[PDB]
Design a protein around this ligand. Sequence first.
Ligand SMILES: NC(=O)N[C@@H](CC(=O)O)C(=O)O
Ligand SMILES: NC(=O)N[C@@H](CC(=O)O)C(=O)O
Ligand SMILES: [Zn+2]
Ligand SMILES: [Zn+2]
Ligand SMILES: [Zn+2]
Ligand SMILES: [Zn+2]
Lengths: 363, 363
Amino acid sequence: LVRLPGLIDVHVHLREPGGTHKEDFASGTAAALAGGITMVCAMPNTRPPIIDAPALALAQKLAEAGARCDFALFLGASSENAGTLGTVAGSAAGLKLYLNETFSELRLDSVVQWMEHFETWPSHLPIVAHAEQQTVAAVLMVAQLTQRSVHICHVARKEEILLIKAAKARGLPVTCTVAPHHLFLSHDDLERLGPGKGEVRPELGSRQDVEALWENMAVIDCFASDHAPHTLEEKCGSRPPPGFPGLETMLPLLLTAVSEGRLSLDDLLQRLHHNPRRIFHLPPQEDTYVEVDLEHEWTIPSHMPFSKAHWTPFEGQKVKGTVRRVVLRGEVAYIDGQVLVPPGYGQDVRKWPQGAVPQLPPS
Amino acid sequence: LVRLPGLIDVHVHLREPGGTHKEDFASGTAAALAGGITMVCAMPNTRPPIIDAPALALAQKLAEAGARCDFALFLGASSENAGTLGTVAGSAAGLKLYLNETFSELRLDSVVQWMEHFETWPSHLPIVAHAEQQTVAAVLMVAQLTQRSVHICHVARKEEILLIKAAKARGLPVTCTVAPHHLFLSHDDLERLGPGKGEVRPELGSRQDVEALWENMAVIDCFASDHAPHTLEEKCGSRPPPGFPGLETMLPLLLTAVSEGRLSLDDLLQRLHHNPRRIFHLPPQEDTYVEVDLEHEWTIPSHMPFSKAHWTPFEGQKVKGTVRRVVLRGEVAYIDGQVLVPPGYGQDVRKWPQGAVPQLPPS
Ligand SMILES: NC(=O)N[C@@H](CC(=O)O)C(=O)O
Ligand SMILES: NC(=O)N[C@@H](CC(=O)O)C(=O)O
Ligand SMILES: [Zn+2]
Ligand SMILES: [Zn+2]
Ligand SMILES: [Zn+2]
Ligand SMILES: [Zn+2]
């Protein structure tokens, strides 16, 4: 067995409030623990969406009562809320901008609206953007015009990682995350998945996109699942929403890659622990660790045990490595397929004294 | 009468070679002279497209034999020609990038291809981009990464002009052009035009887009027609190509605006003479001038006399101001509805000693 620190997934969709047949805080954080994850950051594209103080207050209580691991909640940018989030901004994981079409009603239709958010959101707090292809260059321009940093979530294309690489070479403050489906799946998999299951944003890339991401691993700051649960009925239906569940498969896939020498254990810990902490200013978790077994070989089944999504695009993949035990803040939280902490054990890390983002005092 | 210097239209499509039922050098430059224009820069989206030395050589001869006014020819960026244009680059007006869907096969599908052109095209030579909405921010980012300037053609939206305004305020080297249809037409006109005639890229904007362009006139560097002739049969057909003819209506519309006090005569001369010269390094034309009459009131007819397009989206608009006489290099070129210089009178200004772009000698 190997002992790892508590891993952090900075990009999950837990569907509560409003989509709880797909997942809720209790089921989604159970999936997190089973995947060796002890802290999650939940996206705001719920129903109602987390785009104002009252929606945030509601989500916070739902999470505090339902979460089994620790968490922070993102606020979402809308066409109406720029300049209105200053009072609650510090209590959120960060601000999420949806800049392309995806499972969300929050798309901003004008770059001027992006600028307004970059100008009004506190400068010391994280901004994350769903930005695909040329949109990555556009949001980078807005970040430069407003003189601040931006984080690009789920980078999926050779085009995108090479653009980010060029920006870092010029010293621009940009960081990025890559999700496991964009490292381990490609167009070649759509035959097997079909057009419904295969729907995700950004879409699965070519083999060349996948190869470019591996070749440019040094450019990738974080891994995150983009856990996006939808039921099989929805994925197989007439208007399939995009997204894959992934909390329970992420670490097993990456541990397999480690065992094959495609990256080191440190590469993994930088991207699932240290970089998430430092980019999102997330606090340490006392007495918290994950024990993995690197020798157990298994095949991913048609669905993982915990997520309500009840399906997985990785069905049939051979992996080596499994999560054996998770201890969270001194309590056994997970052992071999059984979660052992109840809904509500998890806490909002932004309310911990060490979880606040340091800022310069009033002028 | 008022005497103006020779006006320059930096963005015309003359359709030769390959689309000569829509327009050719002879008919298109006749339309230019009638519109008070003595020098045009022709775009490369012809058939074959001007994307290599042999296509350029062909277009140059066709222009030299057919043009009635002076001209320069753009090269077009393709997915294959980056790094191959150095030998002929200096003979072109500049390099044109097509970054969105429009009447062209030259769209570049990856921002990496944009970067390659910005890195390989000589740094002292003009680059123009068809870039809409967020694409404006994206190409600006590529210009910054490669540390050079870019010119944005046909700006049509409040979103775009405000982005450019913000970039100029930060001292970024960007310039832009606005076409008359985006100052004088809007959504409100689509009722009258219909869905076929009304097809253009960028599409007609809202009244708010139009108002934003007028309010931000100080941000606009050039006016150009984006003369994009297609026959009525094509515009009224099942797959209408986008674009308006505009060489013969541009100056009359702008002179009307001058007479109404919406801008000054100087505002007009900066944008149709001085700024085109300095951004594209176009040479002066000896013994060349345009005489306009600011008092004659008339209504734009169903088609203007010269363009083969044989239709106009400005039909029915009341204008005040008309071109009475054009002298080009010491010859009467146009009087009151009659062109008096033959096809081939016009010359390639990039072959004039004063028409070369100054550059630092070899290292
Ligand atoms: N990526 C997806 O395909 N879906 C995500 C939304 C998102 O991350 O854009 C979801 O919330 O379902
Ligand atoms: N603007 C248009 O609607 N059409 C132009 C092309 C262009 O300028 O994009 C054309 O060549 O027809
Ligand atoms: Zn997303
Ligand atoms: Zn997401
Ligand atoms: Zn264009
Ligand atoms: Zn054009």
